[PDB]
Amino acid sequence: SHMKILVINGPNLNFLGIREKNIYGNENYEYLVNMINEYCKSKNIEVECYQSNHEGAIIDKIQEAYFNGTDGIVINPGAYTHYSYAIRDALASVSHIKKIEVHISNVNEREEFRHISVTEPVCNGQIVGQGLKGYIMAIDMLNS
Amino acid sequence: SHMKILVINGPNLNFLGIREKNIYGNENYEYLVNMINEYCKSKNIEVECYQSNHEGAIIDKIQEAYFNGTDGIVINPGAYTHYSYAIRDALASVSHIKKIEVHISNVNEREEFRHISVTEPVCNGQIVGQGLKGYIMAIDMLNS
Amino acid sequence: SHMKILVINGPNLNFLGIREKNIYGNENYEYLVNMINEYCKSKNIEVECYQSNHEGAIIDKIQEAYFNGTDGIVINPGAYTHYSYAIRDALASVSHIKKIEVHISNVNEREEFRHISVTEPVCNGQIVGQGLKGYIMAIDMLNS
Structure with a gap:
């Protein structure tokens, strides 16, 4: 491992x-995890994929990254993107871990509330509406 | 059981x-659960009443309804009605389960923030300010 | 103990x-807990300091205060101050427990979203931008 990455998916993205x-x-959460895993293996990147529906469990997981040698975080907060200032503050608290925000869908084509990201201002980049390949694009930003 | 229903109550409604x-x-949470239970028994409806203060535990419970033959959901999200886009997205993810939103109080007579429901657009009906009998009215909508 | 107090700190304040x-x-969470503990000991006040990143665990802890003889609550909800109507409703549900809201930073000098407190209207006082000594000032309001 030249680099250790944590990928966080928020609520509902297990479906x-x-x-x-x-x-x-049409591709499922198991497909996404295995695609990530296999890509990282090919680049000699150590990766963990984590999902939870719990806002507090996502914060706890971000805090643990401060102590276990994590270099970078890829995060899709799901619906929490649009209102969780607690997850924003957790990301800000790990200022020396690089962070990339990912959204699968084109959020700018959907309900007005999906246009707001409270997390994006404390991240180091954002990928929107590129489908599952947005996660690979994020890993390459971290690995560059 | 001709039909299986899940009733979810959100934060604070145990008080x-x-x-x-x-x-x-003046009637308590135990009264409400027993009233539901006994009504459903009289109509040959299988029912489970579930409460949690945890947003993530409510989402987990909605996801489990996809796999256990649930036909309908009655939900009072409590204060999460006014901001939980994560619970809205959980309800949308079970598109073939009928859903009825219930509020005990007349929310339109209270603080301005209580006028907003982020969950109502993905449900199949809403009952407001009818007191505890709103839950029976919801079961009858599901059973019709 | 002439008085029993619960101090709640919300998400991220363990960092x-x-x-x-x-x-x-520059002073850490361990410093804050010990400073509180020692102050209360000097005034013959029984105190528990509690922290969680979980919105639902904070609500559960507030509910438990209704049954265990708590007299007063000091609460810094952290980022949940700016959006958790569920924590506001938990505080309102314990109407005979006195409550003081504390913020360490001068929130009026920071991002616009930090100006909003959804919890302050159901509390009995608020202390803002006095640093860690704001918690001692809150205990003295409760003890007066």
Whole structure:
């Protein structure tokens, strides 16, 4: 491992592929985790993929990254993107971990509330509406 | 059981009756659960009543309804009605489960923030300010 | 004990001192807990200091204060100050426990979202931008 990355997916993203196929595509959460894992293996990057529906469990996981040698975070906060100032403050508290925000869907084409990101101002980049390949694009930003 | 229903109550609604009697009435959470249970028994409806203060535990419970043959959901999200886009997205993710939103109090007579429901647009009906009998009215909408 | 107090700190405040030193100062969460503990001991006040990143765990802890003889609550909700109507409703549900809101930083000098407190209207006083000594000032309001 030249680099250690944590990928966080927020609430509901464990239901990728099996539900709302017209918004987030046909490929499921297991596909996404395995695609990430295999890409990172090919680049000699150590990766952990983590998902939770709990705001507090996401914060706890971000705090643990401060103590375990994490270099970078890829995060899709899901619906928490649009209101969780607590997750924003958790990201700000790990100022020397690089962070990339990812959204699968084109959020600017959906409900007005999805246009707001309270997390983006404390991150180091954002990828929107590129589908599951947005996670690979984020890893490459971290690895560059 | 011709039909299986899940009733979800959100944060603070376990303190019904013992607190804020002038807003939500004199009858407690135990009364509400037993009233639901007994009504459903009389109509040959299988019902589970669930309460949590945790946003993430409510989402987890909604996800479990996708796999256990639930037909309908009655939900009072409590204060999460006014801001939890994560609970809205959980309800949207179970598109073939019918959903009815319930509020005990007349929310339109209270603080301005209580006028907003982020969950109502993904439900199949809403009952407001009818007191505890609003839950029975919701079950009858599901059973019709 | 002439009086029993619960001090609640919300998300991220366990990272006091080690992170964001220019915003919240150089002294850490362990320092704050011990300073509180020792002050209360000197005044014959029984105190418990509690922290969690979980909104639902904070609500659960507030509910438990209704049954264990708590007289007063000092609360710094952290980022939840700016949006958690569920924590506001938990505080309102314990109407005979006195409550003081504390913020370490001068929130009126920071991002616009930090100017909003959804919890302050159901409390009995607020202390802003006095640093860690704001917690001692809150205990003295409760003890007066």
